[PDB]
Structure formats: structure tokens, C-alpha cells
Design a protein around this ligand. Sequence first.
Ligand SMILES: [Lu+3]
Length: 17
Amino acid sequence: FIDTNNDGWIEGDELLA
Ligand SMILES: [Lu+3]
């Protein structure tokens, strides 16, 4: 996955990556 808001968690659009 790729974390697009750089928070350290995988959530939203990040889960389809
Ligand atoms: Lu995130």
C-alpha cells in the first residue's frame, strides 16, 4: 500500500493501492 496523507495508517484510497 501507499499512505497518501502520511499518517502511518492505511485508510481510504490507500487500501485500493
Ligand atoms: Lu493514511
